[PDB]
Amino acid sequence: RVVTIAAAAIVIIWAASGFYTIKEAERGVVTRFGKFSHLVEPGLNWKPTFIDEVKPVNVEAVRELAASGVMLTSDENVVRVEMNVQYRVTNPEKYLYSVTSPDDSLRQATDSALRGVIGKYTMDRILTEGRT
Amino acid sequence: RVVTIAAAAIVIIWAASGFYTIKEAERGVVTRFGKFSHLVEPGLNWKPTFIDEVKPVNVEAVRELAASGVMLTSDENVVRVEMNVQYRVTNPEKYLYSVTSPDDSLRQATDSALRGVIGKYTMDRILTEGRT
Amino acid sequence: RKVDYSTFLQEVNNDQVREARINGREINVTKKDSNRYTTYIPVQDPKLLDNLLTKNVKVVGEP
Amino acid sequence: RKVDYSTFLQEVNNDQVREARINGREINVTKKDSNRYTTYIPVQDPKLLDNLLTKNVKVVGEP
Amino acid sequence: RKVDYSTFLQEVNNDQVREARINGREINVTKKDSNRYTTYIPVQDPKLLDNLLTKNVKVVGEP
Amino acid sequence: RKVDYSTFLQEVNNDQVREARINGREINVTKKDSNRYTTYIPVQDPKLLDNLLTKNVKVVGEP
Amino acid sequence: RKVDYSTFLQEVNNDQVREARINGREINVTKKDSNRYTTYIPVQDPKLLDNLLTKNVKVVGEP
Amino acid sequence: MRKSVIAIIIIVLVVLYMSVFVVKEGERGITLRFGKVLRDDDNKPLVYEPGLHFKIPFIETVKMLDARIQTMDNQADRFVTKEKKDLIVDSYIKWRISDFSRYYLATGGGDISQAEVLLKRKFSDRLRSEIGRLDVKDIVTDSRGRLTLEVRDALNSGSAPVINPNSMAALGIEVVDVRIKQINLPTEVSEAI
Numbered sequence: 001r002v003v004t005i006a007a008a009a010i011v012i013i014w015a016a017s018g019f020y021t022i023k024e025a026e027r028g029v030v031t032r033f034g035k036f037s038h039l040v041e042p043g044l045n046w047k048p049t050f051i052d053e054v055k056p057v058n059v060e061a062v063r064e065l066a067a068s069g070v071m072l073t074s075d076e077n078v079v080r081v082e083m084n085v086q087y088r089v090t091n092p093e094k095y096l097y098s099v100t101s102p103d104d105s106l107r108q109a110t111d112s113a114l115r116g117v118i119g120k121y122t123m124d125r126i127l128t129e130g131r132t
Numbered sequence: 133r134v135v136t137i138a139a140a141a142i143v144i145i146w147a148a149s150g151f152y153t154i155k156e157a158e159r160g161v162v163t164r165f166g167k168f169s170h171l172v173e174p175g176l177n178w179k180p181t182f183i184d185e186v187k188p189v190n191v192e193a194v195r196e197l198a199a200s201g202v203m204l205t206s207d208e209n210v211v212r213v214e215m216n217v218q219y220r221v222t223n224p225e226k227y228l229y230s231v232t233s234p235d236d237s238l239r240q241a242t243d244s245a246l247r248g249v250i251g252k253y254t255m256d257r258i259l260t261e262g263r264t
Numbered sequence: 265r266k267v268d269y270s271t272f273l274q275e276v277n278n279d280q281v282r283e284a285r286i287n288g289r290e291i292n293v294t295k296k297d298s299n300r301y302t303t304y305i306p307v308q309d310p311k312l313l314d315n316l317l318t319k320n321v322k323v324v325g326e327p
Numbered sequence: 328r329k330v331d332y333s334t335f336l337q338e339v340n341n342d343q344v345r346e347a348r349i350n351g352r353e354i355n356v357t358k359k360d361s362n363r364y365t366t367y368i369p370v371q372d373p374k375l376l377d378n379l380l381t382k383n384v385k386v387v388g389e390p
Numbered sequence: 391r392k393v394d395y396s397t398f399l400q401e402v403n404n405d406q407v408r409e410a411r412i413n414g415r416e417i418n419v420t421k422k423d424s425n426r427y428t429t430y431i432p433v434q435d436p437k438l439l440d441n442l443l444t445k446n447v448k449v450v451g452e453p
Numbered sequence: 454r455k456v457d458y459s460t461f462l463q464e465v466n467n468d469q470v471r472e473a474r475i476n477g478r479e480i481n482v483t484k485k486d487s488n489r490y491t492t493y494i495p496v497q498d499p500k501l502l503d504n505l506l507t508k509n510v511k512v513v514g515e516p
Numbered sequence: 517r518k519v520d521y522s523t524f525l526q527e528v529n530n531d532q533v534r535e536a537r538i539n540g541r542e543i544n545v546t547k548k549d550s551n552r553y554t555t556y557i558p559v560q561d562p563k564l565l566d567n568l569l570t571k572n573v574k575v576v577g578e579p
Numbered sequence: 580m581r582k583s584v585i586a587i588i589i590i591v592l593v594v595l596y597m598s599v600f601v602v603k604e605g606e607r608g609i610t611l612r613f614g615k616v617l618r619d620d621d622n623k624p625l626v627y628e629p630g631l632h633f634k635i636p637f638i639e640t641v642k643m644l645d646a647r648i649q650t651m652d653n654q655a656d657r658f659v660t661k662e663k664k665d666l667i668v669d670s671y672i673k674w675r676i677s678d679f680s681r682y683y684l685a686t687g688g689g690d691i692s693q694a695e696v697l698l699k700r701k702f703s704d705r706l707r708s709e710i711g712r713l714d715v716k717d718i719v720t721d722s723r724g725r726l727t728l729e730v731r732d733a734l735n736s737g738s739a740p741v742i743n744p745n746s747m748a749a750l751g752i753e754v755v756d757v758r759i760k761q762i763n764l765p766t767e768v769s770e771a772i
Binding site: 031033034035036069071072074076077078096097098099100101104105108109111112115116119120 | 716
């Protein structure tokens with residue numbers, strides 16, 4: 001009788017530890033022993049404890065980045081330029097496995113693109129008709 | 133059976149003293165008495181004590197030294213010249229059994245070569261296009 | 265995640281923080297890129313809330 | 328309803344609140360448009376009471 | 391070890407401390423030369439936190 | 454032996470104290486002439502700690 | 517015999533008492549004419565120590 | 580008795596726990612035995628793709644190799660243009676491990692530091708040689724169309740299934756993108772401007 005009660009107890013603990021919650025805004029990526037099991041919607045869900053792991057990622061929220069710098073223009077001129085970049089996460093497996101720390105990579109890419117675009121234009125043209 | 137026990141103890145001491153460890157970046161050279169007959173990779177290895185002598189040398193890591201000097205140019209002009217040299221070690225047999233203290237020899241060779249090259253060109257060429 | 269208070273400050277002055285929730289000594293900090301990390305107050309700072317407000321940082325109390 | 332402390336300060340600075348009942352950390356805000364909500368003071372803010380009195384806002388304590 | 395509070399003050403003025411972990415009453419100081427010791431505050435000093443910040447000294451809180 | 458607070462502050466401005474061990478409400482004080490006594494803060498005074506720090510007077514806290 | 521705190525302030529403003537025995541909230545006061553009484557502080561008053569120190573009024577704490 | 584059964588089951592469970600192997604989706608890691616993991620499976624060592632695996636408890640040690648794009652930034656640099664005017668280029672390079680076995684064998688260690696310094700040296704050298712031919716105005720105007728793409732293509736190909744030992748393809752690394760973040764002038768030129 002002891003073995004049956006022990007089995008009942010261990011399966012009860014298994015089920016109790018199986019449940020987890022994912023916030024409404026976020027999504028989840030579940031991997032069973034690191035094999036990318038599937039994509040998990042928000043709410044209450046169940047997973048085999050000590051077998052698969054779930055990583056939550058904020059998808060609904062909109063992320064903003066600020067990029068500022070002293071930048072050289074075409075007519076041997078330097079200007080302080082500030083930009084804001086709004087971006088959102090999609091297909092979270094790409095956001096999680098393609099590039100380490102995607103936010104820093106996007107920051108560096110934004111700085112590079114800003115330098116490339118600002119290099120072409122002259123100072124007065126920027127200062128007057130920049131925005132568009 | 134006292135002699136047998138002593139012999140077993142000596143064998144156990146041999147086994148416990150033979151083994152040595154090598155870090156990942158290093159490479160070992162094992163010498164059979166005076167002669168070296170094998171080079172050992174970065175892993176756990178066993179050697180017969182007093183019959184084989186192991187010496188580890190770092191390989192992957194890069195050494196960096198500085199060569200700075202007051203120098204006479206082609207037109208008899210004084211210039212302060214600074215350079216950094218980065219080198220690595222290959223063929224540990226040559227690194228250990230060719231020159232006494234190869235680091236100092238390389239330092240002096242770098243200083244002599246830099247002296248020979250700086251004096252060939254005039255002062256302004258060194259000042260302007262010295263970088264490449 | 266636990267992050268110390270100083271770098272939280274120069275993140276605040278460099279406006280990477282969006283929402284900060286202060287239940288007790290601890291602060292639940294959310295960055296502009298929706299990355300959240302907890303911070304602990306070493307000692308009460310009268311200038312802390314003023315600095316947070318001037319930098320237009322969202323501040324949330326707790327029950 | 329719960330409204331954040333920074334939002335409440337932005338509201339009072341814009342002349343939108345009428346009376347504020349302060350019960351310790353908790354504050355019961357009544358707007359000029361007869362809308363009531365509740366906020367909480369994150370940390371001790373000396374400037375809060377001065378800001379409330381300056382903007383001609385009724386302030387009421389409680390037992 | 392233990393170190394006087396004034397010693398800590400003049401020490402941080404000369405910029406050779408690196409990490410300062412605040413646990414309520416106690417302070418666990420880390421030197422620039424990997425030297426660790428302990429300091430205690432005489433009485434609540436508002437200028438302490440400002441002084442530590444302006445000299446780029448890491449400050450770490452505790453739960 | 455207990456020494457009056459006004460006399461204590463005047464003596465500190467006289468630069469005649471060397472060490473002051475502060476125990477919260479209490480202070481244990483050593484004069485420059487190796488005279489030991491004990492004094493009391495009437496009510497919390499940060500200017501006390503300011504005066505002792507600017508006078509290069511040793512200040513000691515304890516666990 | 518109990519004396520108003522305000523009356524205490526204009527009385528000491530007139531340089532008429534000598535000693536102030538501060539026991540938490542209550543204060544034992546002796547005038548220049550050897551008249552002794554007790555006064556009570558309504559709330560915490562930081563300017564009290566500055567005013568008492570400026571006008572050469574001696575203060576003594578209690579264990 | 581039942582005590583012996585409990586002892587044996589707990590001992591086999593702890594043996595399994597000590598011998599369990601887990602590899603995450605992000606990175607591919609191979610076992611590190613002191614002597615033999617080098618030259619496993621004839622010339623090419625085992626790759627050990629992500630998933631469950633079994634390991635000998637003490638003959639080998641766990642270690643992982645990352646399998647996604649890394650970024651290496653050069654904080655400051657000094658370059659001489661064609662007209663002998665100094666320039667400071669702050670640029671970042673993104674690199675992906677192409678073949679894991681050759682990446683491990685060619686680099687001194689599994690640590691990314693050695694590969695990073697090799698890439699920095701080659702990239703810096705490659706960049707310096709390329710820039711010297713141009714002028715500062717052309718550098719600041721259309722660098723991406725004339726420097727970065729050309730440097731990336733040259734570093735991948737190795738000019739100036741055939742693999743050039745000079746090329747980075749000889750190493751396990753591959754370069755996916757090269758960008759120039761910031762360009763700065765010497766303090767004298769900046770003060771003049």
